[PDB]
């Protein structure tokens with residue numbers, strides 16, 4: 001689809017067998033989700049945003065379905081203000097910016 | 100043009116007589132620029148992201164040229180680590196997400 005930006009580009013995602021809403025975020029290198037239970041092993045990591053740095057749980061090679069498009073990649077879980085889909089998965093679903 | 104997301108979607112902008120590199124950021128409601136001394140009246144604002152909030156100065160009706168496309172709107176200025184073009188101006192240059 002072609003998504004205009006007069007509203008927040010929010011979409012439904014499926015991860016760990018659960019539906020969630022997430023923001024397509026071209027300014028994010030990485031995908032960061034709010035606190036949730038995810039299966040598999042994880043490593044502690046730090047990530048920085050506009051206001052500072054936070055501790056996150058890094059899950060590798062996780063399936064997320066983004067508006068029916070499959071991606072398998074790294075998902076960070078921690079105290080982000082919003083579920084964000086970052087470029088690491090946006091590229092997997094073939095997302096581009098156009099103007 | 101079409102911008103893939105393999106790398107950060109950085110583009111050249113023109114603001115207040117200065118050329119800068121800025122992120123085309125679909126996850127940003129507002130446009131936030133690195134500290135710079137603009138003339139005119141402003142209002143204090145707080146904007147939140149990963150790591151917490153930063154204090155910024157809100158300037159209204161500021162003209163920004165984004166890869167040759169002119170836009171005019173609200174621009175926030177503060178201690179951000181990156182110049183961020185938000186949705187308030189992305190809509191004005193006809194920027195869409197596509198996948």
Ligand SMILES: CCC(CC)CN(C[C@@H](O)[C@H](Cc1ccccc1)NC(=O)O[C@H]1CO[C@H]2OCC[C@H]21)S(=O)(=O)c1ccc2c(c1)OCO2
Nearest residue numbers: 027028029030048049050082126127128129146147148149
């Ligand atoms: C509330 C949803 C997002 C944060 C979750 C909002 N951000 C825009 C993101 O694109 C920032 C934009 C950003 C980019 C680099 C540095 C600081 C901010 N990216 C970001 O935080 O990404 C982080 C996760 O991947 C990593 O790669 C970049 C930082 C990490 S933000 O920079 O904090 C931002 C911008 C304009 C705004 C605002 C918040 O509130 C209203 O107006």
